[PDB]
């Protein structure tokens, strides 16, 4: 069912909303090692999920592996590079062009028809994200010396957007194959660690956050996102992805790590209005 798969895809957005909550618990653990650990756990969850369903699946042609490994590892590598070359606030904003990109790129899908409401819904969601991420004390100061980081952040957005949209092309490919993508990505991230990374391993309670990231925002989110991309409404899930920054901030406020703000209220209205325009009014606004 299309509504089901779309609802299923939205669970990935929910799980990715919890990232900022566990980011603080990571500590000084560098990104590639953290990726290697969490994606091994993530890939392991996918394997375990297949065993319960009683699932030869990893026998796939090379374009499948180019898509999955190039997708998952690609956007990870360039986003980590963006964090190296540019302040996190501007890097995060540039990368979060990816939901709009998915909406726009969904027009290349044969069965999908892009309506004005989808694009408008995405633009409202981007608008909310801009207000939110810019609500920091310093604000948004884009400086020419950080341009290599912005480009890396843009590369990240495009690679993830193409990976997501192109996943529908591989709709015949089983969801459990993503486990292969995660394990391969973890293997590569392990290599990038030994080469470019300081050896800082998780200690004490930091391990519990690592496992949470591995099971949730990785071990379930990538599989439930795969389902949404292959069987759900891609242009809608693009629109709904701008809920992640808002839900993320709402979590921190409830957790006590952040405070309620006008910017949060405005972002909330924009993403609620944006989702409503793209879901309820999509067909009705054509007349």
UniProtKB/Swiss-Prot annotation:
Result for mutant: residue 76 to A: Abolishes the transport activities for both threonine and methionine
Q: Which InterPro entries match?
A: EamA_dom
All ranges on the Periplasmic side of the membrane: 24-30, 84-87, 137-146, 196-205, 256-261
Protein name (database record)? Aromatic amino acid exporter YddG
Gene name of this polypeptide: yddG
Tell me what the record says results from residue 79 to A.
Answer: Enhances methionine transport and slightly reduces threonine transport
Q: Transmembrane stretches, by residue range?
A: 5-23, 31-53, 63-83, 88-108, 116-136, 147-167, 174-195, 206-230, 234-255, 262-281
Highest rank taxon of the organism: Bacteria
GO BP, sorted A to Z: amino acid transport
Q: Which family does it belong to?
A: Belongs to the drug/metabolite transporter (DMT) superfamily. Aromatic amino acid/paraquat exporter (ArAA/P-E) (TC 2.A.7.17) family.
| Topological domain ranges for the Cytoplasmic compartment | 1-4, 54-62, 109-115, 168-173, 231-233, 282-284
What's the source species for this entry?
A: Ancylobacter novellus (strain ATCC 8093 / DSM 506 / JCM 20403 / CCM 1077 / IAM 12100 / NBRC 12443 / NCIMB 10456)
Q: Which PANTHER family does the annotation name?
A: ACYL-MALONYL CONDENSING ENZYME-RELATED, EAMA DOMAIN-CONTAINING PROTEIN
Catalytic reactions of this protein = L-threonine(in) = L-threonine(out); L-methionine(in) = L-methionine(out); L-lysine(in) = L-lysine(out); L-glutamate(out) = L-glutamate(in)
Q: Where in the cell is it found?
A: Cell inner membrane
Q: What does this protein do?
A: Amino acid transporter with broad substrate specificity. Can transport various amino acids, including L-threonine, L-methionine, L-lysine and L-glutamate.
Q: Which residues form the EamA domain?
A: 6-133, 148-278
The free-text domain note is:
The overall structure is basket-shaped, with a large substrate-binding cavity at the center of the molecule, and is composed of inverted structural repeats related by two-fold pseudo-symmetry. The central cavity functions as the binding site for a wide range of substrates.
